[PDB]
Ligand SMILES: Cn1c(=O)c(-c2c(Cl)cccc2Cl)cc2cnc(Nc3cccc(CO)c3)nc21
């Protein structure tokens with residue numbers, strides 16, 4: 294029953310324990326939701342995140358084994374590699390089905406790993422092995438059917454998200470004196486949000502403070518309440534709150550690269566190619582699929598409200614969320630002012646919002662991504678937007694945008710909200726979109742034309 298650490302973890306919450314990647318551990322038990330476990334190492338005993346470690350008898354211990362990663366995600370991971378960079382992944386839908394993804398001369402080759410009647414694994418029928426590791430080791434020395442050898446495991450660059458800072462049940466409150474406030478973020482577009490350092494861990498964070506005469510208190514507290522319940526890799530994560538006395542604080546993880554809109558407008562388009570844009574759009578759809586299933590609506594989905602972290606990780610800002618049984622409608626009080634270009638027709642006309650109006654906004658966000666941040670509805674005056682949309686006018690396909698991506702945009706922009714796809718359908722559509730050629734290849738066909 295031994296485990297090995299897959300990522301480094303530094304102790305700071307006094308009941309937590311520091312571990313080093315590759316070190317062995319004995320697990321004693323789990324916390325209330327299984328997300329943390331009490332472990333013993335040669336250095337001590339304490340709580341560590343459960344997914345930062347794995348059984349010594351598990352495939353995850355191998356640097357090249359990335360588990361449940363999709364074909365498209367694999368192409369993103371390997372976009373930063375070289376000839377011979379590779380990884381082994383498993384199908385999320387159908388467990389047990391694995392494939393090798395390998396980079397060679399700027400292209401990624403995908404190979405299904407076959408299993409014989411006696412359980413042996415192989416890519417080439419002439420070379421079968423008892424275990425996955427033996428198969429990889431064999432192809433690490435001779436290509437034997439593959440375009441080239443498997444030489445460089447794709448790095449696992451991102452530590453798994455930890456939903457909070459403690460293994461204990463509800464321990465959100467923290468000491469304001471342990472927070473050093475720094476400069477405001479976003480030039481004020483997000484309100485009173487500042488970069489800060491959480492001394493106790495010398496950890497950089499984002500802090501929203503309830504200064505007098507700004508946000509209404511009930512609103513601020515509801516936001517804090519909602520955020521305690523949100524747990525998804527692509528939604529900004531809450532780390533703590535200071536609600537014992539003013540100024541109230543909401544403290545979250547810090548996204549280092551700012552918002553997606555600015556990132557796309559200022560990026561190196563060589564580095565941030567179509568496979569990277571697809572990777573980011575997919576992450577956003579995953580976050581929205583979660584809100585959809587958890588009965589929340591966003592109402593402000595746009596690239597300026599998506600934040601970018603390391604290795605193109607993208608998280609949707611989750612301030613302002615509203616609780617709404619998925620299928621019901623939320624009505625805004627007349628007079629509410631909305632960002633017209635991202636607002637669905639039923640919202641513009643009747644102030645009605647639902648997860649379907651978020652689907653419409655996602656379509657506009659997808660167009661912003663595909664254009665590297667262009668302002669929507671170019672060549673059109675806002676006063677005529679609703680009228681034009683009613684006549685079935687929709688933005689034109691962005692230069693180089695693959696046809697299937699634009700069709701998804703058009704599905705999101707169906708006039709009747711019930712005709713639009715769900716976020717579950719949208720996420721699944723991205724994952725199955727380029728199965729017989731890469732997005733890179735499709736962009737080519739679109740341009741060459
Ligand atoms: C702008 N903003 C927020 O509003 C929240 C946040 C908070 Cl503090 C409370 C509740 C909900 C959210 Cl989304 C979290 C957050 C985290 N990271 C960042 N990073 C960021 C934003 C703009 C510019 C830069 C570059 O210095 C870096 N910006 C963030």
Ligand SMILES: CCCCCCCCCCCCCC(=O)O
Pocket residue numbers: 567570571572574662663664692693694695698736740
């Ligand atoms: C999910 C997002 C996928 C959309 C990707 C669109 C990529 C467009 C690339 C445009 C090609 C550059 C043309 C040019 O400037 O000469």
